[PDB]
Design a binder for these strands. Structure first.
Lengths: 123, 229, 37, 167, 166, 338
RNA sequence: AUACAGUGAAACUGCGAAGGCUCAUUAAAUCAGUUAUCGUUUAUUUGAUAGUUCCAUGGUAUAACUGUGGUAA
RNA sequence: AUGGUAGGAUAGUGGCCUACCAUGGUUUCAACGGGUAACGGGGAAUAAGGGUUCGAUUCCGGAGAGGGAGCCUGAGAAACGG
C-alpha cells in the first residue's frame, strides 16, 4: 500500500472521530490504510450539510460520482420534470461502491477543483 | 435605505445611519441615534443626541459608551440616569425592536446564548456570547445554545439555563423572528431545519434553525419580565 | 503530452529576425576540406 | 571660473572669480577628494592646499562625489531620473568648491583675517557636560499590577477547582 | 507566479468564451524561490497587513531531528538526490520541503557519545552513516514560507522506504 | 587609488567588491549595481553599451547603459532564469528554470513559448536564424526565428547536455553531454559529424562536460568538465588534448577567449570560486581573480581589459587588468584613478 | 519673569480631499439571497489577556538656522 | 481535459502552477453552443386610498486615467492622487 514516494503516512495508526451520527469502521480506526482525506482519520474536519443519492460512475480511483434526483414543485407547466445532479467524491475504506448504492456525503474543505464531499455512509 | 427592525418612519431623511462596529452584527442591532432620537424621542436631531451623549446619560450594559452609532443588539439593557430609565429591548412578533421598560433588579443582569466552548490556551475553559463576553470558567456541561446570565457589575456568569426538550426559547432569525411559546415539538436534524418548535394561540407549528433560537427560561417562569398588550 | 511539444506556428516570432545570405565567412568547400577527417 | 573656498575651523568662506584658465588648469582631471596645491592655481597663495568638495557647473547642475565621466549623466537619486554632472572637474564648471586645510604664505583679509563665531551652546545635559519620583511611581504601579493580576488569575482558577470538585 | 483563479481555465463541464477580467491583487502569485545552499539570506516580504513572510533562498543551518528520541540539532546541507515533484530539481540541487538531503552527522555523533559514553541497538544501514558521517534526512519546514530548514532524520523503516526508491 | 590583490608579478583591481574616508572618496562606477542578495548571469551586448544582468529573487533583466553609468529598467520576469542570449539592439531571448522561453523587446515580453523538457542552455544562430536549445535527454531543440516553426530535434545520447555552442566563422555545433562525449553536430546538414571522447589521467569519477567554447579562427575548441579541468582541442591529432587541473576544482562554468584584444593566445577559465587566466601552448597561469564569495558565472567586455562577474552576494564585482588592456571609453578615467 | 513664558509670515508635524466621466455589448459564470471557513486576512468596535540578573541615567550625526554660491529656471 | 501523490505560491482550501501516474468528466432527466424592444431585464426596491406591465431605485458587462509592460505604498489597491 505504498506506490508513491515522500513518506506516505498519516500526518498527526492515527484515528479520530468527526462525531455527528456517522460510524468509523474498524479498519479505518486501526488499519493499514493511510486515510489522507477520508474524514474519519483524515486531515479534514466536518461541517456544513449532508447530501444523499445513488451513483453513475466510479471509474477513476478516489472519484465517486453521485447522482441526486429530487422532487421540486414546478408551477410553470404544472408537472414535475425530474432532477439530476452530479458531485465527485473521494474514497473511504468501507465500501467499494458499484452502480446503484444510495450513499451520503458531508461538506468539507475543497479537495480537488470540484469536490467538497466525502463518503460517510453506505446502506 | 433602512432595515425592517428599527421601526423607522419613512418621512425621516435620505441617508440612513449605518451602525458602527461593536458587540452585535449590523443586521441584528439598532444604534443609539435611531434609539433615542426617533423611537422614544429623547432628542430631535443628531446634534442634540450627540450633546446628550457627550453629557453621558446612557449606561448600556452598565458602562457609559458615549457613541452615536453604538450597535445595541438583543437585550442590551439601556440605562439612563435621569428618571432611572431601565430599558430591555427584545423582539416583537412582527420583526421590530420592542423596547420594554424594566426595573433595577432586572437591569442588574442580562442573559446570553453561548456560541462555543474552547480549550483555547493554557487549560482555560472559555465561553462567548452574542456581545462576546469572554468570561472565565463555566461548568463542563455548557453545550452550544445554552444561556448564561451575566453579572453586569463584574462579568461573571451567575445562573445557567440548560438547553433541552422542555425549555422556554426565543427565536431571533428567519421567518420565525420574534416568537414565543416553545412547545409543540422537538426535532434535531443533522445540518438544517433543526430546532424546538413554538406554539401559537391555536398552538400552531414552526420551523427554524439552532443558531436562530436561544433560551430565556422555563415553561411559565422566565426571570426576564416581558411586555404585554 | 498535452502542452509537451506543440508543433504549431506562432505569431510574433514568424518575423522576429531576418536571415543573412553569405553567413559563414568560410566556404562550404572549406567546410568539406576542413573536416574531411 | 569662480572658486568657492572655505576655512572650516575659523568659519570663513568666500568666492573668487579667477579668470586666466592656465591658472585653473591645475584642477583639471582631478576628481573629488584628491588634494591640490596653491602653487599652480596662484602665486600669491603658495603653500596652500584645498580638498575639493564638488561644485555646480554652468546650467547649475551639481556633481556628486566619486562616480566617473566629467560630462553630465542621468542617474537615480532621492527614485527618479535626475541629471547630475560627473565628479571629475573639467573646463566647464561655473563654481568649484574648495576647503583650505592649511594656510600657506599670505594672510587673506577675507578668509584668515576675518572670521565668524558659532551659533549657541548645547542644550542636552550630556552635551553641556561633554525623574526619581517617576522611578518611585513606576515601580509601585508595577508591583501593584503584579499583586493584582497574578493573584486574581489564581483566584478564579480556584473557582475552576471548586467547579471541578463539585462536578 | 501568475494567478490563483478558475477563470483562466476550464471546469468539469468544458466551457469557453472566457475573456473575463483584469486580474486583481488577491490573485497574487509570487515568483518560485527555489531555495539553495549558500550564505544565509532570507527576503522579508510583506503581505496582508504586517504579515511578514520569510522567503529563504540560501539557508544552511538545518535543524534536523533525531527520530527515536526527537533531538532537533543543528547541521549543514549537502544535496538532494531524489525528489520527483520535479526530477530536474535534484539535477539543479535546490532545497524544498519533503526533500531527502544529506547531512554530515557530526553533532549527532557528539550527542550519542555524550549521552551514551561509547561510540559506534540502532539499525545497521544508519550505523554505516554513524561511522562515515553523511546520513539521509528529509526536510519538514518550508523555507519558501516560514524561511526555515527543519527536518527529520532517516531511521530504519523510512530509510529503506527511500533507499528502495532511489 | 584602488587597492590591488597580490598575484604573479601582475596587478588586478576590483570595483564593487564586498568591501567596496572611503565614503567621501568613493570609487563607485555603476550606480545601483546591487541585486536581491545573489546574481544569475551577466553579459555585455555587442555594441559599446547596454549590459544585461539577470535577477535573483523576483528576477529582473537589469539593462545598464554604459554611457549613463546606471540602470535603465528591471523587467521582473515571471520565473527564475538560468540561461539567455542577446540579439541585436533591443531584442533578447531567455529561458527560465522551468521549460519556458521569454522574448523581451523594447516594450518587453513579446512572447512566452515553451520546450517539452526542462532546458539548460540556449544559443542563437546568426546564419538562417534558429536558436538551438539544449535540454535533458535525447532532445536538442530548435526554435527558428524565421517563420516561428519547430525543427526535427537533434537526437542525443541518454542523459542530455549541459551546454551548447555553435562556431562563429564556420558553424560547428557543440553539445557538452554527461558521458564525456562532445557530440559535434553540423548546422548545415542537421546530422552528427563526430562524437569525440574526453580523457584525463586522474579519473576521479565519471565527469560530465559542462562548458563549450570556440573562437573566431574556427580551428580550436575549448572544453570543460564537472571537475575543474580545462581542455583544448584541434582537428590536428584530435584524440589527445592539453589539460588544466585547477587547485580547487569543483565545476568549471565559464571558459572564454581573448581573441579580439591584444596580449594574445590567452584564455579565461572560471569555476565556482576562482577565475583564472592562462596562456595557450604552455598552460601557465597569467593571472587569477580571487573574490570574497562564490561565482555564478562571469563575462569579459570586448576591446578592453575588464571583467564582470555574477556572484552569490549583493553586488557584482568588476575586475580591471591594467596589463591586459586599458579601461574603455565610458570608463576612461579608471586609468586616472587607479 | 537676565535658561522657557503672548501676536506669530515660512518650515517639520496630526489629519483633509474618505470615492468622479466615457467607451466595446456579459444569459443565474454579471447579480441577489443562502451554507461554511478547527479552508483564511483583518486597522478601527466590543469582552478578555505577561514571572531566566558572578569580578542616580547611556553616543555622535542631521535639520530648521547662518554663511558662500551656481543656473534662464 | 478528469482525478490521484508531492512540492511551489498563497491570506489560506484548491491542477491555482510544475514533475510523475491513471483516461477520465458533462450530456435527450436538455451538455455545449445561437440574439435582441441584455438605452432593456431580472423583486433590485419604495410603494402611492382606482394609473392595472407609465408610476421608486441598486446593477447593463468589464475596463481607462495618451498606449500596452514592469515595480512600489497600505487594515483594504495590481491607486483617479507614485
Amino acid at each position: 500500500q505504498s506506490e508513491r514516494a515522500f513518506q506516505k503516512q498519516p500526518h498527526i495508526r492515527w484515528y479520530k472521530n468527526a462525531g455527528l451520527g456517522f460510524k468509523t469502521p474498524k479498519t479505518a480506526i486501526e488499519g493499514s490504510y493511510i486515510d489522507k482525506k477520508c474524514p474519519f482519520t483524515g486531515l479534514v474536519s466536518i461541517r456544513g450539510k449532508i447530501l444523499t443519492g445513488t451513483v453513475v460512475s466510479t471509474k477513476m480511483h478516489r472519484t465517486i460520482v453521485i447522482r441526486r434526483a429530487y422532487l421540486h414543485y414546478i408551477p410553470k407547466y404544472n408537472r414535475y420534470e425530474k432532477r439530476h445532479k452530479n458531485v465527485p467524491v473521494h474514497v473511504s475504506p468501507a465500501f467499494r461502491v458499484q452502480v446503484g448504492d444510495i450513499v451520503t456525503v458531508g461538506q468539507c474543505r475543497p479537495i480537488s477543483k470540484t469536490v467538497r464531499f466525502n463518503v460517510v455512509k453506505v446502506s | 435605505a433602512a432595515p425592517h427592525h428599527w421601526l423607522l418612519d419613512k418621512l425621516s431623511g435620505c441617508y440612513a445611519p449605518r451602525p458602527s462596529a461593536g458587540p452585535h452584527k449590523l443586521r441584528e442591532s439598532l444604534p443609539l441615534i435611531v434609539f433615542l432620537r426617533n423611537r422614544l424621542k429623547y432628542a430631535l436631531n443628531g446634534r442634540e443626541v450627540k450633546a446628550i451623549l457627550m453629557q453621558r446619560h446612557v449606561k448600556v450594559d452598565g458602562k457609559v459608551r458615549t457613541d452615536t452609532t453604538y450597535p445595541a443588539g438583543f437585550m442590551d439593557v439601556i440605562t439612563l440616569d435621569a428618571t432611572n430609565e431601565n430599558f430591555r429591548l427584545v423582539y416583537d412578533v412582527k420583526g421590530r425592536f420592542a423596547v420594554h421598560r424594566i426595573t433595577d433588579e432586572e437591569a442588574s443582569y442580562k442573559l446570553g446564548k453561548v456560541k462555543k466552548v474552547q480549550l483555547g490556551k493554557k487549560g482555560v475553559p472559555y465561553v462567548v456570547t452574542h456581545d462576546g463576553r469572554t468570561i472565565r470558567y463555566p461548568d463542563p456541561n455548557i453545550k452550544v445554545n445554552d444561556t448564561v446570565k451575566i453579572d453586569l457589575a463584574s462579568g461573571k456568569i451567575t445562573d445557567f439555563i440548560k438547553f433541552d426538550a422542555g425549555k422556554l426559547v426565543y427565536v431571533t432569525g428567519g421567518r420565525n423572528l420574534g416568537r414565543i411559546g416553545t412547545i409543540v415539538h422537538k426535532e434535531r436534524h443533522d445540518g438544517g431545519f433543526d430546532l424546538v418548535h413554538i406554539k401559537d394561540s391555536l398552538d400552531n407549528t414552526f420551523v427554524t434553525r439552532l443558531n436562530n433560537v436561544f433560551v430565556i427560561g422555563e415553561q411559565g417562569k422566565p426571570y426576564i419580565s416581558l411586555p404585554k398588550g | 503530452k498535452g502542452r509537451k511539444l506543440n508543433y504549431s506556428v506562432q505569431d510574433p516570432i514568424a518575423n522576429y529576425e531576418a536571415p543573412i545570405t553569405s553567413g559563414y565567412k568560410w566556404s562550404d568547400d572549406q567546410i568539406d576540406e576542413f573536416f574531411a577527417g | 571660473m569662480k572658486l568657492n573656498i572655505s576655512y572650516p575651523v575659523n568659519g570663513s568662506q568666500k568666492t573668487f572669480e579667477i579668470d586666466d584658465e592656465h591658472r585653473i588648469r591645475v584642477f583639471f582631471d582631478k576628481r573629488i577628494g584628491q588634494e591640490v596645491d596653491g602653487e599652480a592655481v596662484g602665486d600669491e597663495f603658495k603653500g596652500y592646499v584645498f580638498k575639493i568638495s564638488g561644485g555646480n557647473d554652468k546650467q547649475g547642475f551639481p556633481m556628486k562625489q566619486g562616480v566617473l565621466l566629467p560630462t553630465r549623466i542621468k542617474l537615480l537619486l532621492t527614485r527618479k531620473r535626475k541629471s547630475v554632472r560627473g565628479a571629475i572637474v573639467g573646463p566647464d564648471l561655473a563654481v568649484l568648491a574648495l576647503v583650505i586645510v592649511k594656510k600657506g604664505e599670505q594672510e587673506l583679509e577675507g578668509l584668515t583675517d576675518t572670521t565668524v563665531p558659532k551659533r549657541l551652546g548645547p542644550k542636552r545635559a550630556n552635551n553641556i557636560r561633554k525623574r526619581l519620583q517617576r522611578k518611585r511611581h513606576q515601580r509601585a504601579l508595577k508591583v501593584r499590577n503584579a499583586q493584582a493580576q497574578r493573584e486574581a488569575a489564581a483566584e478564579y482558577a480556584q473557582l475552576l477547582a471548586k467547579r471541578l470538585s463539585e462536578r | 507566479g501568475i494567478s490563483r483563479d478558475s477563470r483562466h481555465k476550464r471546469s468539469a463541464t468544458g466551457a469557453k468564451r472566457a475573456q473575463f477580467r483584469k486580474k486583481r491583487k488577491f490573485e497574487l502569485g509570487r515568483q518560485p524561490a527555489n531555495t539553495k545552499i549558500g550564505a544565509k539570506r532570507i527576503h522579508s516580504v510583506r503581505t496582508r497587513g504586517g504579515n511578514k513572510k520569510y522567503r529563504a533562498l540560501r539557508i544552511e543551518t538545518g535543524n534536523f531531528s533525531w527520530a527515536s528520541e526527537g533531538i532537533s540539532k543543528k547541521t549543514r546541507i549537502a544535496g538532494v538526490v531524489y525528489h520527483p515533484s520535479n526530477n530536474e530539481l535534484v539535477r539543479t540541487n535546490t532545497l524544498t520541503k519533503a526533500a531527502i538531503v544529506q547531512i554530515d552527522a557530526t553533532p549527532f555523533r557528539q550527542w550519542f557519545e555524550a549521552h551514551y559514553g561509547q561510540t559506534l541497538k540502532i539499525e545497521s544501514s544508519v550505523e554505516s552513516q554513524f561511522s562515515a558521517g553523511r546520513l539521509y534526512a528529509c526536510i519538514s519546514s518550508r523555507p519558501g514560507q516560514s524561511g526555515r530548514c527543519d527536518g527529520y532524520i532517516l531511521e530504519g523503516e523510512e530509510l529503506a522506504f527511500y533507499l528502495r526508491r532511489l | 587609488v584602488l587597492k590591488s590583490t597580490s598575484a604573479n608579478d601582475v596587478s588586478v583591481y576590483q570595483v564593487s567588491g564586498t568591501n567596496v574616508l572611503e565614503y567621501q572618496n568613493r570609487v563607485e562606477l555603476i550606480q545601483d549595481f546591487e541585486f536581491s542578495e545573489a546574481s544569475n548571469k551577466i553579459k555585455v551586448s555587442r555594441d559599446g553599451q547596454y549590459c544585461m544582468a539577470t535577477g535573483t529573487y523576483k528576477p529582473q533583466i537589469h539593462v545598464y547603459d554604459f554611457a549613463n553609468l546606471s540602470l535603465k529598467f528591471d523587467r521582473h520576469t515571471d520565473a527564475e532564469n538560468v540561461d539567455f542570449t542577446i540579439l541585436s539592439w533591443t531584442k533578447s531571448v531567455h529561458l527560465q528554470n522551468d521549460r519556458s522561453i521569454q522574448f523581451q523587446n523594447k516594450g518587453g515580453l513579446h512572447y512566452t513559448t515553451r520546450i517539452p523538457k526542462f532546458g539548460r542552455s540556449l544559443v542563437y544562430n546568426k546564419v538562417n536564424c534558429d536558436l538551438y536549445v539544449g535540454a535533458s535527454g535525447n532532445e536538442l531543440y530548435r526554435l527558428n526565428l524565421e517563420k516561428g516553426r519547430f525543427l526535427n530535434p537533434f537526437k542525443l545520447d541518454t542523459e542530455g547536455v549541459n551546454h551548447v555552442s555553435i562556431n562563429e566563422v564556420n558553424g560547428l555545433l557543440a553539445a557538452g553531454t554527461e558521458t564525456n562525449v562532445v557530440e559535434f553536430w553540423d548546422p548545415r546538414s542537421r546530422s552528427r559529424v563526430s562524437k569525440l571522447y574526453l580523457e584525463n589521467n586522474i579519473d576521479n569519477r565519471p565527469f560530465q562536460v559542462t562548458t563549450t567554447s570556440f573562437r573566431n579562427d574556427g580551428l580550436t575548441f575549448a572544453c570543460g568538465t564537472s571537475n575543474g579541468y580545462s581542455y583544448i582541442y584541434d582537428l590536428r591529432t584530435s584524440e589527445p588534448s592539453i589539460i588544466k587541473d585547477q587547485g580547487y576544482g569543483f565545476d568549471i562554468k565559464k571558459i572564454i577567449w581573448l581573441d579580439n584584444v591584444g596580449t594574445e593566445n590567452k584564455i579565461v577559465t572560471c569555476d565556482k570560486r576562482i577565475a583564472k587566466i592562462w596562456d595557450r601552448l604552455d598552460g601557465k597561469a597569467y593571472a587569477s581573480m580571487e573574490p570574497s564569495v562564490d561565482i555564478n558565472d562571469i563575462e569579459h567586455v570586448p576591446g578592453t581589459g575588464m571583467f564582470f562577474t555574477a556572484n552569490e552576494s549583493i553586488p557584482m564585482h568588476t575586475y580591471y587588468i591594467p596589463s591586459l588592456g586599458p579601461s574603455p571609453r565610458w570608463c576612461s578615467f579608471l586609468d586616472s584613478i587607479t
